Amino acid sequence: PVILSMVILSLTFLLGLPGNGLVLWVAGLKMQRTVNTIWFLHLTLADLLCCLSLPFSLAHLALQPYGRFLCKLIPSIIVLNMFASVFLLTAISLDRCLVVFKPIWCQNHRNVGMACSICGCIWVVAFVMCIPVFVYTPLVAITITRLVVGFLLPSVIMIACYSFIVFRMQRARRQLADLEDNWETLNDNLKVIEKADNAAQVKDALTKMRAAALDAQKATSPEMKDFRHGFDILVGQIDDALKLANEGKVKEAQAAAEQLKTTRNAYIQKYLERARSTLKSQSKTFRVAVVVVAVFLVCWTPYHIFGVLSLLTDPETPLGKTLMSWDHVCIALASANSCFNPFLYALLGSIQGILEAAFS
């Protein structure tokens, strides 16, 4: 099945250089450097460095043609890019979970300088794990070390961080839904009261409005202060209308209830818009990260599976022949991950709108 590996690798290169170059150039010399975009820039740079080495592997597979370098360094680029990508992805997930975490580690030193320092640290940490591959049974230990460091622990970290993030996103949702329900009963009762004659239905509608307003003010920092002050004014106005309707005046209660609309729009509408806006975006920002992580892991799993199988299985076996036959396909797919990654940005994203907005 060597021809299948050949064709898939050639297709990966043919569609890998253009996309990587386009994304790198658009994200690099268009907008300003921020703590968020820098990580994706580093990830795409590592993927581009990985993609640059494909023709050497193609020549090695096709000819099996000068020097030791064919068997010396170009096999190490896969390990290097895998490790750098894993560490950068776990750093992105850690930061995404940190944003919603305690503010003590949010405003301490969160700056572009810290971002590039941590990126350099990540590159160095990925580098110190590259030496064992290049230099030099060892196969017993090095395969286990790569699997444990590159696959298990970071995947656990991303799973925990994203489970906490989705649990926190599932919570606020309901809270908003409750506030929207209270808003809807307030609005429809205020619509009922205008067309309702008699002094009894006015009191019945105002009782419901008062309960809804109290519940809405209960649901939840000058922002909060202003939000609660608006509802205090709302409840006071409801009381004015209630005490007008109690003494058998209908039109005055109608006007008093009409006065509620001004305060409602002036106070609570802006908070409603902010709550709806913030919840919607964070959804997409988390969506892209989760999809990227899932694609990365599903691309890299066959390689680890075949490594474990080769380590466990004794040689001089036809099953060994099958596994070394399919090793080319496994490595080819692992490398095709690099070409796959840039396309999901446009899938889940004017060039600026489809690329730059995808990170923020």
Author numbering: 22 to 85, 89 to 160, 331 to 365, 1001 to 1049, 1060 to 1118, 370 to 439, 449 to 459
From the reporting publication:
Anaphylatoxins C3a and C5a, generated during complement activation, exert their pro-inflammatory and chemotactic effects by activating their respective G protein-coupled receptors (GPCRs), C3aR and C5aR1. These receptors are expressed on various immune cells, including monocytes, basophils, eosinophils and mast cells. Here, we report the cryo-electron microscopy (cryo-EM) structures of C3aR in three distinct conformational states: apo, intermediate, and fully active. Structural comparison of C3aR in the apo, intermediate, and fully active states provides novel insights into the conformational landscape and activation mechanism of C3aR and defines a molecular basis explaining its high basal activity.
Thus, we changed our approach and determined the structure of the ligand-free and G protein-free apo state of C3aR, to capture its inactive conformation. Given that C3aR exhibits high basal activity, and forms a complex with the G protein in the absence of an agonist, we engineered a C3aR-BRIL construct, in which ICL3 was replaced with the thermostabilized apocytochrome b562 protein (BRIL) to stabilize the receptor in an inactive conformation. Then, C3aR-BRIL was purified in complex with anti-BRIL Fab and an anti-Fab nanobody. The structure of this complex was determined using cryo-EM at a local resolution of 3.6 Å in the transmembrane domain (TMD). Our apo C3aR structure represents the first inactive state of this receptor, serving as a valuable reference for understanding the conformational changes associated with C3aR activation. In both the apo and intermediate states, H8 adopts a reversed orientation toward the cytoplasmic center of the TMD, a feature previously observed in antagonist-bound inactive structures of C5aR1. Notably, in these inactive conformations, helix 8 (H8) of C3aR is oriented toward the cytoplasmic center of the transmembrane domain (TMD) in a reverse orientation compared with conventional H8 positioning in GPCRs. This unique H8 conformation is stabilized by a hydrophobic interaction network involving residues on H8 and TMs 1, 2, and 7. The ionic lock formed between R3.50 and D/E6.30, a structural feature observed in some class A GPCRs, has been proposed to stabilize the inactive state. However, in C3aR, at these positions, R1203.50 and Q3726.30 are present, which do not interact with each other, as observed in our apo structure.
